[PDB]
Design a protein around this ligand. Structure first.
Ligand SMILES: *[C@@H]1O[C@H](CO)[C@@H](O[C@@H]2O[C@H](CO)[C@@H](O)[C@H](O)[C@H]2NC(C)=O)[C@H](O)[C@H]1NC(C)=O
Ligand SMILES: CC(=O)N[C@@H]1[C@@H](O)[C@H](O)[C@@H](CO)O[C@H]1O
Ligand SMILES: *[C@@H]1O[C@H](CO)[C@@H](O)[C@H](O)[C@H]1NC(C)=O
Lengths: 48, 48
């Protein structure tokens, strides 16, 4: 029901964030890519 | 003409940032160092 990121060797999920991820290129390149709402921890801290 | 940071074993350049570089000391102690702009993502993000 919800996507997470975990270390490969012991199941301990976390929210998918721009601190837990990095970017290259665009979605039409990766074969088997998926849609997901990636948290940017700066946006609440700019708005509030 | 421009300076990039890239992974050692496959050329894939990135504009040099505070997310890709760490800091120590000052520019006098290093040998063969050069001047270039470091992109700080936070200045556009605060000013937006
Ligand atoms: C991820 O979401 C995007 C939209 O944000 C999907 O893009 C659609 O792709 C279909 C097939 O070509 C088009 O008919 C739609 O018009 C597109 N939507 C928009 C808003 O442009 C994309 O297909 C989704 N990918 C996955 C794997 O779910
Ligand atoms: C990302 C990716 O490779 N997805 C494929 C999918 O397209 C295919 O229909 C399925 C069965 O062959 O195997 C998987
Ligand atoms: C590299 O070697 C040249 C001599 O060929 C010297 O002039 C230059 O200052 C050296 N640069 C660094 C970073 O060591």
């Amino acid at each position: 029901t919800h996507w997470f990121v975990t270390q490969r060797n012991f199941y301990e999920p976390q929210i998918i964030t721009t601190d837990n991820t990095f970017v290259s290129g665009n979605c039409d390149v990766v074969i088997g890519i998926v849609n997901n709402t990636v948290y940017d921890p700066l946006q609440p801290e700019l708005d509030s």
